[PDB]
Coordinates of C-alpha atoms and ligand atoms in Angstrom, one line a residue:
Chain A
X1 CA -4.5 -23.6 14.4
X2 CA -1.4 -25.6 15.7
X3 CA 1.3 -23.7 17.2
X4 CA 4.8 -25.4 16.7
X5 CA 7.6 -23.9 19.6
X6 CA 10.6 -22.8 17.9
X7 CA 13.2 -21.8 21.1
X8 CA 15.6 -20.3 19.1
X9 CA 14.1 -17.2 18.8
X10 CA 14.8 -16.4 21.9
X11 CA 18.4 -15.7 20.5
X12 CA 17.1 -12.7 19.4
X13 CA 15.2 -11.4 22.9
X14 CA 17.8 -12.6 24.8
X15 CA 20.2 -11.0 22.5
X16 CA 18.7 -7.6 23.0
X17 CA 18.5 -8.7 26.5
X18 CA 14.6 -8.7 27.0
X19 CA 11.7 -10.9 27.1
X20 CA 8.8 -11.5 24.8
X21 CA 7.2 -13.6 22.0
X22 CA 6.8 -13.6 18.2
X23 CA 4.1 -15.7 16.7
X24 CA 4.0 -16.6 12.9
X25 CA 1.9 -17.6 10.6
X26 CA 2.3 -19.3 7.3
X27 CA -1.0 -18.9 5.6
X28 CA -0.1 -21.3 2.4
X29 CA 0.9 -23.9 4.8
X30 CA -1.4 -23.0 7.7
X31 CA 1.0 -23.7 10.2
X32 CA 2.2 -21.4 13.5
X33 CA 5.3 -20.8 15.0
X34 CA 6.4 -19.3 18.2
X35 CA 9.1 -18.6 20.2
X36 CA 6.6 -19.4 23.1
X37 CA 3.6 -21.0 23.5
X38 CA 2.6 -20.0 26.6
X39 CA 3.1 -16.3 26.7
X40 CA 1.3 -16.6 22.6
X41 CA -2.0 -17.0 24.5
X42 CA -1.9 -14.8 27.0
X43 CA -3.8 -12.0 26.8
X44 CA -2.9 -8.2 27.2
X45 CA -4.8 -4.6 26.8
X46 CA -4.5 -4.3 23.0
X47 CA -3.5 -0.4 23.2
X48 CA -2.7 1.2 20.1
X49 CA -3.5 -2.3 18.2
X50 CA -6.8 -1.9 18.8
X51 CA -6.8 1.1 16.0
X52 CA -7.5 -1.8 13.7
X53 CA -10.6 -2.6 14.6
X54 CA -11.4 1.0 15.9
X55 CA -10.7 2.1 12.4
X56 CA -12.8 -0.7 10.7
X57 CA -15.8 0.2 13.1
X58 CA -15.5 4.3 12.3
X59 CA -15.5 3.7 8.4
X60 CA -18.4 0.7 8.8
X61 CA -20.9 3.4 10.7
X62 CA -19.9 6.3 8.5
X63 CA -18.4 7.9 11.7
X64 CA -15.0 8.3 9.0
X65 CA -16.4 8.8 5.5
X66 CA -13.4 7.7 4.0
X67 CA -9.3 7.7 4.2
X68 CA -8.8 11.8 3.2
X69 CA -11.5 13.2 6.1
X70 CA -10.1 15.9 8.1
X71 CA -9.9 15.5 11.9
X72 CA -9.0 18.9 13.0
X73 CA -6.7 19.2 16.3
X74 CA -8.7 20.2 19.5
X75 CA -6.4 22.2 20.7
X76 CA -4.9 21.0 23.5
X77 CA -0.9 20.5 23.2
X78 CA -0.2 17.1 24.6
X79 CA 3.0 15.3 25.1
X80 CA 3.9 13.5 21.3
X81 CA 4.2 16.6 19.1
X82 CA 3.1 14.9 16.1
X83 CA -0.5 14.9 17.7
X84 CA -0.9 18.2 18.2
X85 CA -2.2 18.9 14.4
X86 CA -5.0 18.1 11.7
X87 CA -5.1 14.2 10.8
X88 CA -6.6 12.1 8.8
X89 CA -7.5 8.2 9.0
X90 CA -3.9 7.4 7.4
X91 CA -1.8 9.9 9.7
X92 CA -3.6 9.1 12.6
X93 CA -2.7 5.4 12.4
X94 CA 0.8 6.1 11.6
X95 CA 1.3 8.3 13.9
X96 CA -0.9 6.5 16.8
X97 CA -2.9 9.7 17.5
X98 CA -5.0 8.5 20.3
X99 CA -7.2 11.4 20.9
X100 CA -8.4 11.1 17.4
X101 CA -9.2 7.5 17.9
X102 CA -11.3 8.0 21.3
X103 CA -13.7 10.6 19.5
X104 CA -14.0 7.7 17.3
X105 CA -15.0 5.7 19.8
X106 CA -17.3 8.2 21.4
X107 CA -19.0 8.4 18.3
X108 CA -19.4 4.8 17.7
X109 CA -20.9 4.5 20.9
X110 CA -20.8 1.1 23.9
X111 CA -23.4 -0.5 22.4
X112 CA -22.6 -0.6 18.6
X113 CA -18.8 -0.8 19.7
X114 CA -19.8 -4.4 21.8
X115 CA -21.6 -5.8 19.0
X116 CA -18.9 -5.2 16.7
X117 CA -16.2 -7.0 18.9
X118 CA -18.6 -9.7 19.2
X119 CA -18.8 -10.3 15.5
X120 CA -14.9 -10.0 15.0
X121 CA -14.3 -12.1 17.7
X122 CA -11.8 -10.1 19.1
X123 CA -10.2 -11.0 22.2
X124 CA -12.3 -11.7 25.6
X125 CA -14.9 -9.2 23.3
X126 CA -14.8 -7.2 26.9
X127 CA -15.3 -3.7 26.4
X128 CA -15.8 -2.6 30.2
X129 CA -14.6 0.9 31.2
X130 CA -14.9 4.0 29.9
X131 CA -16.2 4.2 26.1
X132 CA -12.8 6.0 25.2
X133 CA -10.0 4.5 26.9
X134 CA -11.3 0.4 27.8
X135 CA -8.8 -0.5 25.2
X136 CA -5.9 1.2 27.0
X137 CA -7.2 0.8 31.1
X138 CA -10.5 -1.2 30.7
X139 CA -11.8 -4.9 30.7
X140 CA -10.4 -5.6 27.0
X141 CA -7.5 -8.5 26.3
X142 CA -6.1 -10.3 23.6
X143 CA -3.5 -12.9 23.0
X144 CA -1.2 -12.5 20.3
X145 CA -2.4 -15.9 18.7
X146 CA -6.0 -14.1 18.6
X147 CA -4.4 -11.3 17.0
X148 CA -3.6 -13.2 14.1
X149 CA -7.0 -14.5 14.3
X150 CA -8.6 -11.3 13.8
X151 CA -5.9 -10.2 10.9
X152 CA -6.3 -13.1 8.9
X153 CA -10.3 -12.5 8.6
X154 CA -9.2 -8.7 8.0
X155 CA -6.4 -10.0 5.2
X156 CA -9.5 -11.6 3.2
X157 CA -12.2 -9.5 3.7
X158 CA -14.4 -11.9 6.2
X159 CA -15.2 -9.7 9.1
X160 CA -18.5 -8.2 9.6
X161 CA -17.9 -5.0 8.0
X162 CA -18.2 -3.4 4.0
X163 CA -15.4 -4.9 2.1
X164 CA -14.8 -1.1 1.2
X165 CA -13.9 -0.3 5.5
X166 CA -11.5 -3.6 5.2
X167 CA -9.2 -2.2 2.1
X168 CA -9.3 0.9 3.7
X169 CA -8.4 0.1 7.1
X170 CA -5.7 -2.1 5.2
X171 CA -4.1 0.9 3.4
X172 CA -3.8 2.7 6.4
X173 CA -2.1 0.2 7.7
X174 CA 0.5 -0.2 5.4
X175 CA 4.0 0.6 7.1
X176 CA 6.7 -0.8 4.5
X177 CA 7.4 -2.0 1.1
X178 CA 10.1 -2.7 -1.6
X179 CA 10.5 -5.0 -4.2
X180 CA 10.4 -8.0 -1.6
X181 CA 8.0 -7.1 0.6
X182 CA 4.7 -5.5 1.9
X183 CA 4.8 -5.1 5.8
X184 CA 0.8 -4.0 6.7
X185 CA 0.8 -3.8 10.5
X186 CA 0.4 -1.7 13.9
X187 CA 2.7 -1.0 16.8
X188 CA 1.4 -0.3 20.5
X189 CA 2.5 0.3 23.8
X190 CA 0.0 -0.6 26.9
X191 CA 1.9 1.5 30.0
X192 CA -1.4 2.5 31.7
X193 CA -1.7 -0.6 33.4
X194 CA 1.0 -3.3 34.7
X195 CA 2.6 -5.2 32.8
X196 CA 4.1 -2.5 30.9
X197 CA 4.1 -4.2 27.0
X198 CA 4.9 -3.3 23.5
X199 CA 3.1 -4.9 20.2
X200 CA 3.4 -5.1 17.0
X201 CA 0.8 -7.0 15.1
X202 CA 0.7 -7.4 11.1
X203 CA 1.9 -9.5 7.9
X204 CA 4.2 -9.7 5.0
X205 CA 3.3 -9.9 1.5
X206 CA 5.0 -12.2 -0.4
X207 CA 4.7 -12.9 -4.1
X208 CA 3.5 -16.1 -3.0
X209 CA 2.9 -16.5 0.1
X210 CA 1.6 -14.3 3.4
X211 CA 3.4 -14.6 7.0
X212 CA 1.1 -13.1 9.5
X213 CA 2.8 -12.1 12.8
X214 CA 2.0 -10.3 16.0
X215 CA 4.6 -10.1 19.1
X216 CA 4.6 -8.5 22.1
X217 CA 7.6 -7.7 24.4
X218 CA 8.4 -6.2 28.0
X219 CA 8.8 -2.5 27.6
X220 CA 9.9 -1.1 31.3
X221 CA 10.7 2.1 29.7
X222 CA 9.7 3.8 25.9
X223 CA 13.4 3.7 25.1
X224 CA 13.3 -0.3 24.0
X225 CA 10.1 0.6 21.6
X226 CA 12.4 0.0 18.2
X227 CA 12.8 -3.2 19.1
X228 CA 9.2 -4.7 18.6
X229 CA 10.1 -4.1 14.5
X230 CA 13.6 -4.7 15.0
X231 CA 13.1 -8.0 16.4
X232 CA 10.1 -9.5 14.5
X233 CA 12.5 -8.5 11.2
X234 CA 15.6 -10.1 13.2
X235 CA 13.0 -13.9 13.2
X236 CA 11.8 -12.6 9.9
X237 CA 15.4 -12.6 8.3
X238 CA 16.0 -15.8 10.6
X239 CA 12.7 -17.8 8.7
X240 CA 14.2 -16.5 5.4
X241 CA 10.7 -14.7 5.1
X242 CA 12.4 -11.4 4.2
X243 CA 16.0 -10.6 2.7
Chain B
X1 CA -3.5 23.1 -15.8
X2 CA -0.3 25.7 -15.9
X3 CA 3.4 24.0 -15.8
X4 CA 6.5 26.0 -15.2
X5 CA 9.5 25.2 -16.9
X6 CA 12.3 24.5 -14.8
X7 CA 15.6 23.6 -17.0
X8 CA 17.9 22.4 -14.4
X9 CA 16.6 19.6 -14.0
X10 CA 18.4 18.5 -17.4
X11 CA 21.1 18.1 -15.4
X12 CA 20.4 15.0 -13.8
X13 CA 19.8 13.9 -17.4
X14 CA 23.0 15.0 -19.2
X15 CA 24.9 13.7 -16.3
X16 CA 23.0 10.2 -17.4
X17 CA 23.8 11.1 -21.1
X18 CA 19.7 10.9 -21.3
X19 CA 17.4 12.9 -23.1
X20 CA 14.0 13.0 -21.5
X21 CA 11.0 14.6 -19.4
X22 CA 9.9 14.7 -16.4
X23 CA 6.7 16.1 -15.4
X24 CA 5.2 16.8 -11.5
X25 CA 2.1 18.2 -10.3
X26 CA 1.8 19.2 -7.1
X27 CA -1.9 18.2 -5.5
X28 CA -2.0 21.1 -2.9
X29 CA -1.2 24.0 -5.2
X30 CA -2.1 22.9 -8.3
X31 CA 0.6 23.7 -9.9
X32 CA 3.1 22.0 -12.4
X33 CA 6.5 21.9 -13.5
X34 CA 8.8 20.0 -15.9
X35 CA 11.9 20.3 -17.5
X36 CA 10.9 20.6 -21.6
X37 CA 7.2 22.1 -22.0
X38 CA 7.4 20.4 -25.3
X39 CA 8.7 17.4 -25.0
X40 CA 5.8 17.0 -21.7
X41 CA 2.9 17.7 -24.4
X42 CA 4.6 15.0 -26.7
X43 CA 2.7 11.5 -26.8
X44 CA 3.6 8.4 -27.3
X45 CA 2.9 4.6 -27.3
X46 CA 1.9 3.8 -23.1
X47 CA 3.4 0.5 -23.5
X48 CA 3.4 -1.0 -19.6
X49 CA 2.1 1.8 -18.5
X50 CA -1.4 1.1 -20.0
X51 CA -1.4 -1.9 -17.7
X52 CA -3.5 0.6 -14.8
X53 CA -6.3 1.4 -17.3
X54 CA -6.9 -2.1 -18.6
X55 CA -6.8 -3.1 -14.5
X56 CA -9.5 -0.9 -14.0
X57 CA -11.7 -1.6 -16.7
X58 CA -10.9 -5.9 -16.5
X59 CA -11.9 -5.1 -13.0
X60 CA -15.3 -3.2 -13.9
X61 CA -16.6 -5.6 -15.8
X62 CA -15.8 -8.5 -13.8
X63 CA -13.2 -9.9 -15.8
X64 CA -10.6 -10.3 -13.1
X65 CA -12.8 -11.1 -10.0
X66 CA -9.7 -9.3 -7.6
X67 CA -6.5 -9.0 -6.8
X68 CA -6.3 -12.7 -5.3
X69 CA -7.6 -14.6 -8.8
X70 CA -4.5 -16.7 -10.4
X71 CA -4.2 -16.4 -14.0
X72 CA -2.1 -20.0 -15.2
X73 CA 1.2 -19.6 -17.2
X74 CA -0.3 -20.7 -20.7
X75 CA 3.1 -23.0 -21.1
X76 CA 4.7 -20.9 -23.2
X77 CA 8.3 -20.1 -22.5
X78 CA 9.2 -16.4 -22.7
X79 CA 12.1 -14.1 -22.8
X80 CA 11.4 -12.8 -19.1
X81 CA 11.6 -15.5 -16.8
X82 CA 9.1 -14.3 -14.3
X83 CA 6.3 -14.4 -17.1
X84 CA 6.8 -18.2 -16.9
X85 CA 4.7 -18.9 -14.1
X86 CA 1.5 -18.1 -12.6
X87 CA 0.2 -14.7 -11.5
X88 CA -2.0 -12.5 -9.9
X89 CA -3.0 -8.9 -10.5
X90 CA -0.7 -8.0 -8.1
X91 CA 2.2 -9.7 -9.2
X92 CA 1.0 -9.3 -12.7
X93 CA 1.9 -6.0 -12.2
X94 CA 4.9 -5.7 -10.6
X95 CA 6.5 -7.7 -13.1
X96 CA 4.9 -6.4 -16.2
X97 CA 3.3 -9.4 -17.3
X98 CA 2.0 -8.3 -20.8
X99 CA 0.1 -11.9 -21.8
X100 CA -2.1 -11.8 -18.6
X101 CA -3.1 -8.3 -20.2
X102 CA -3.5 -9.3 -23.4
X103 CA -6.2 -12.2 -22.3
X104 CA -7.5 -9.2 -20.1
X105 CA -8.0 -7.3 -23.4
X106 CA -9.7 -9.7 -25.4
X107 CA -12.3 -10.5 -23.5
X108 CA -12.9 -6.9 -22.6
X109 CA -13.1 -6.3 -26.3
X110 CA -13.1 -3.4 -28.5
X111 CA -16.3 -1.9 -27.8
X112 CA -15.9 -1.9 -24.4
X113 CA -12.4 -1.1 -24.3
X114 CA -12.8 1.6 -26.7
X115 CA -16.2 3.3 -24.5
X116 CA -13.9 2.8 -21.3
X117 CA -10.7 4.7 -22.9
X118 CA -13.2 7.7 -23.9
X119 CA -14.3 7.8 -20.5
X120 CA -11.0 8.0 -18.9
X121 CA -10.4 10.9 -21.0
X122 CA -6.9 8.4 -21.8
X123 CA -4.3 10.1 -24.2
X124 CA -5.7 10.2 -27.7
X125 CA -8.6 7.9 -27.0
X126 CA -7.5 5.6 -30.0
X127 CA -7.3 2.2 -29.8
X128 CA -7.0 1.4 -33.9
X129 CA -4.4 -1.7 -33.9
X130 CA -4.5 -4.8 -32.3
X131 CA -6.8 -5.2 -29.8
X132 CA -4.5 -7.5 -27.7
X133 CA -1.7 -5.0 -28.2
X134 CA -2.7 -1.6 -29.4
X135 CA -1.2 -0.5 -26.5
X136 CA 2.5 -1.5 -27.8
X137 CA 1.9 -1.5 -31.4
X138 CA -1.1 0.2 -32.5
X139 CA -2.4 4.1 -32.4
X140 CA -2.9 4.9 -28.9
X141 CA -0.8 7.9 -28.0
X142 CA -0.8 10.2 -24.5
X143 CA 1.9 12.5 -23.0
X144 CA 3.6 12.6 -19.8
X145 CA 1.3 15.9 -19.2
X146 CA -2.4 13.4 -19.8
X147 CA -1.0 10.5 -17.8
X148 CA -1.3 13.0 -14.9
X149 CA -4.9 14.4 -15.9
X150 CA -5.7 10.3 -15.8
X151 CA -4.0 9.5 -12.6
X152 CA -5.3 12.8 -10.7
X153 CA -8.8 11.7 -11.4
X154 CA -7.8 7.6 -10.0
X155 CA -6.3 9.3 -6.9
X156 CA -9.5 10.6 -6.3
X157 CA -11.6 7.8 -7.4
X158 CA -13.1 9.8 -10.3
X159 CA -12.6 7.6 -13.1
X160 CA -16.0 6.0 -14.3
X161 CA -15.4 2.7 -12.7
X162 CA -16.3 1.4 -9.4
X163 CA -14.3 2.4 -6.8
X164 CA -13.5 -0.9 -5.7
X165 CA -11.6 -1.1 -9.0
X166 CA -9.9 2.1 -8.3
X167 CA -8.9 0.8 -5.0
X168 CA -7.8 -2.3 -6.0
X169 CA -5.5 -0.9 -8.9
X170 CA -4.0 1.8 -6.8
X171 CA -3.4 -1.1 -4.1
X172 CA -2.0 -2.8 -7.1
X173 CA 0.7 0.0 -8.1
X174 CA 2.0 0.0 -4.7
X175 CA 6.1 0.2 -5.5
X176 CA 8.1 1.8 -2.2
X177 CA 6.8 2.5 1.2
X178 CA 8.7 4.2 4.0
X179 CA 8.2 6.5 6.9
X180 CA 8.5 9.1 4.7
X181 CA 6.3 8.5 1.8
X182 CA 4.6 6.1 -0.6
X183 CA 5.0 5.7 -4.4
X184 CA 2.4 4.3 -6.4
X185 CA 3.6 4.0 -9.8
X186 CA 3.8 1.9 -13.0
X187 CA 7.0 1.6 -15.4
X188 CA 7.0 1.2 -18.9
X189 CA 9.1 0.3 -22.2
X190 CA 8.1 1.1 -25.9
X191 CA 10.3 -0.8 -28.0
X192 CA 8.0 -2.1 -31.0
X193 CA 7.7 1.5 -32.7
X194 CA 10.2 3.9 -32.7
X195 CA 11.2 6.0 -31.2
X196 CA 12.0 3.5 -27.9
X197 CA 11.3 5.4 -25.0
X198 CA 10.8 4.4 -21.1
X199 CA 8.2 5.7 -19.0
X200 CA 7.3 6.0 -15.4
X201 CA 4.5 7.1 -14.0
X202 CA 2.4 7.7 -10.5
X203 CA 2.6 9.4 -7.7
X204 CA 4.1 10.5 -4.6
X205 CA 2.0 10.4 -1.0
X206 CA 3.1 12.3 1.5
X207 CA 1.6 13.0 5.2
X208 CA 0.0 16.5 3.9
X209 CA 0.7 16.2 -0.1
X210 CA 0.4 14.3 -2.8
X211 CA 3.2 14.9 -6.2
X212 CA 2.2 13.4 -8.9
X213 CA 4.7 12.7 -11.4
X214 CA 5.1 11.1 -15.6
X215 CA 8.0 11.5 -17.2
X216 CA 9.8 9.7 -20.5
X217 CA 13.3 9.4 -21.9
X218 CA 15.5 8.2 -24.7
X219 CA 15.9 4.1 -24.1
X220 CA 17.6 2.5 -27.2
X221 CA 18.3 -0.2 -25.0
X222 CA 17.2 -1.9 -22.0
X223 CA 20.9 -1.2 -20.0
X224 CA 19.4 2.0 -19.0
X225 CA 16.1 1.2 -17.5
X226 CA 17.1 1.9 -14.0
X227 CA 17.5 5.2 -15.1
X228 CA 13.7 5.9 -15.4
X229 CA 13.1 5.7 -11.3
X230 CA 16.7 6.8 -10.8
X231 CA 16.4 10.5 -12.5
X232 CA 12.7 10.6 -11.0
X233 CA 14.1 10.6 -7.8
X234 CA 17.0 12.7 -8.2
X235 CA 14.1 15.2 -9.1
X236 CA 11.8 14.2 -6.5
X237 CA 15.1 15.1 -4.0
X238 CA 16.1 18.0 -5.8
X239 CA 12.9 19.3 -5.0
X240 CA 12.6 18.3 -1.2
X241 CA 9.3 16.2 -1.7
X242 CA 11.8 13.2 -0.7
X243 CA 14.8 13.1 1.6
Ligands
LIG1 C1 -0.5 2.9 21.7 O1 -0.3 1.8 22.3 N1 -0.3 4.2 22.2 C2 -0.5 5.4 21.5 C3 0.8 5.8 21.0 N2 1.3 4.8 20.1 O2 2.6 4.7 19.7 S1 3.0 3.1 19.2 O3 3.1 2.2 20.3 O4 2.1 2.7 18.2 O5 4.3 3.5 18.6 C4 1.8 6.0 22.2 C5 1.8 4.8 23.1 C6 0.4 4.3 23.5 C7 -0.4 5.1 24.5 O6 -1.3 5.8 24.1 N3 0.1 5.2 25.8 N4 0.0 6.4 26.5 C8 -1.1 7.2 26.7 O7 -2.2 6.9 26.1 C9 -0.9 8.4 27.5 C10 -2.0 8.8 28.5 N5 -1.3 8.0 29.5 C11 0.0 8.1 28.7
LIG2 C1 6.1 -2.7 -20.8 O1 6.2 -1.7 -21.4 N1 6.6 -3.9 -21.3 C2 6.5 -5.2 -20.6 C3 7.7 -5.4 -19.8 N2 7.8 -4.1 -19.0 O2 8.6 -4.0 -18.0 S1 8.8 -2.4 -17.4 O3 9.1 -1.5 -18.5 O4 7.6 -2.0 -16.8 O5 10.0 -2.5 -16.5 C4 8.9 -5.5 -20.7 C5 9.0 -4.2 -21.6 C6 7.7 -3.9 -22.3 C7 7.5 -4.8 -23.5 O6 6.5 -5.5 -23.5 N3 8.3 -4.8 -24.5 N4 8.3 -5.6 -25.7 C8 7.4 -6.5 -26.0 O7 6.5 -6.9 -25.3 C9 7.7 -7.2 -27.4 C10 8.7 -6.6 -28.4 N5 9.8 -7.5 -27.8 C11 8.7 -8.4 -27.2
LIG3 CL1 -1.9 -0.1 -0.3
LIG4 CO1 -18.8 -13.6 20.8
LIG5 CO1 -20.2 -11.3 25.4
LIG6 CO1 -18.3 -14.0 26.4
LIG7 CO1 -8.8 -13.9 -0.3
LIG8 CO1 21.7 14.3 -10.2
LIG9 CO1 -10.2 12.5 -2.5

């Protein structure tokens, strides 16, 4: 997978006066872009983007039976509102309802969780720390290049899971579409240890084509978090990939 | 399945100098309502919007392989543009490619298609006509009150096909997609037999809801096809199920 540097992106961090990187992917063409090559493969705690392959894992084992199972709020009233309430696999994505996603992990369990990450290839396949949180303060990284890695197995159904657990993991996914476009993606935001980063990690459907992206940014505080979409569509409309 | 009659929604209608119905279910309560009880019961040609049954049933039997499989322009030029050039079933559908479904139809054949329409439980169950366009020309009827019945039991996988098929055509009918719902739905046009009539048809997913909605109206010419989403969602806001 060759990655060619395309500087001018940076317009659009600069512009917005922050630092990051957006990788692309043409998939007809199989050719890469990126603002930066360097900071494409380095490697970061996944946070929230690692509800992908948490989500994939919980269908594969049966630990979610399928996109419309009920996981009923514990309880306890914690910070992001949306949380505190009954989910289910398609809510809990979009709204990035953490708690949900450790019991997941709980029930999948260190060992079956390893093996897993081992056969997706995802990341440094680390999964050191606690069983419910490595993914947000544990031994887990991944570049943004292996992000695409990972997605593009996911986009044709090659990852060692049911084919079933991929289309549904790729339904919940789904964040926009119009007569242009399909975005299928996930944001996150990995505070709990330095550097302080947001993600967003996805493609766009084309008629005709698929761009895969996943960028990450500085995020000092959570008041800069619109501007992982804002400026993956700002290179998107740049690329003439979307209107 | 009860419907309550609720008349001003004509008004969205008369404003459009339209006649038509419109027809929503909503999931939680079970419980309908329309503007004209009998014009909800009355059935007509499915046009386009037979396109999702003969999906699921060219899926079933391994007639289209999935959603990725190209079916080649045959070289013949025709009056909408976007037929003139390859497709897949996603594409296919979005822009209401009739001669991919009419190869579809012939090789699922008769007695096939015919054992697959009285499973779905679809309209009148009658496919005398054509096989390659029954649909359009020939004696297959259903009302805006059974495309519901049929798309109630796809929304739940229910149908008597796989439910990879069901996945993949639902996938397929993907239209809009926002932050604050998701509209699967298909479109249709009757214009061979009179009278002409457009349809639209699918359904509306919300965080804690599903509306399901089918509804018809007057279309002696094509000038007013916008008009068929555009009074659905006048509707659909009336009613608060979108913003
Ligand atoms: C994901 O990275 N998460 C979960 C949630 N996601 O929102 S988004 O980035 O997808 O929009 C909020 C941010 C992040 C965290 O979970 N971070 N915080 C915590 O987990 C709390 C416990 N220490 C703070
Ligand atoms: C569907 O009902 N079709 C196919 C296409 N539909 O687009 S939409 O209604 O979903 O937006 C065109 C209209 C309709 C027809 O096929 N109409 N007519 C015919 O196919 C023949 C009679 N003139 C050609
Ligand atoms: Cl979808
Ligand atoms: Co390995
Ligand atoms: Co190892
Ligand atoms: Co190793
Ligand atoms: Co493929
Ligand atoms: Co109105
Ligand atoms: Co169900």
């Amino acid at each position: 997978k060759e990655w060619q540097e395309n500087k001018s992106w940076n317009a659009h961090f600069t512009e917005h006066k922050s630092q990051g990187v957006v990788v692309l992917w043409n998939e007809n063409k199989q050719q890469g872009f990126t603002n930066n090559l360097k900071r494409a493969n380095q490697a970061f705690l996944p946070a929230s983007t690692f509800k992908i392959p948490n989500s994939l894992i919980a269908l594969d084992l049966g630990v979610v039976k399928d996109e419309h199972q009920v996981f009923k709020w514990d309880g306890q009233t914690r910070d992001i509102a949306t949380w505190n309430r009954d989910h289910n696999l398609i809510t809990a994505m979009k709204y990035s309802v953490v708690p949900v996603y450790q019991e997941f992990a709980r029930q999948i369990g260190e060992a079956r969780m390893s093996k897993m990450l081992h056969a997706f290839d995802y990341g440094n396949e680390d999964i050191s720390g606690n069983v419910d949180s490595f993914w947000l303060d544990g031994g887990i990284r991944i570049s943004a290049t292996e992000q695409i890695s990972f997605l593009r197995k996911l986009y044709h159904n090659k990852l060692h899971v049911s084919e079933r657990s991929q289309r549904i993991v790729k339904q919940a996914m789904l964040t926009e579409a119009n007569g242009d476009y399909i975005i299928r993606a996930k944001t996150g935001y990995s505070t709990r240890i330095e550097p302080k980063i947001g993600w967003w990690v996805g493609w766009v459907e084309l008629d005709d084509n698929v761009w895969f992206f996943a960028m990450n940014m500085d995020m000092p505080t959570s008041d800069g978090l619109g501007l992982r979409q804002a400026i993956t569509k700002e290179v998107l409309k740049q690329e003439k990939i979307i209107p």
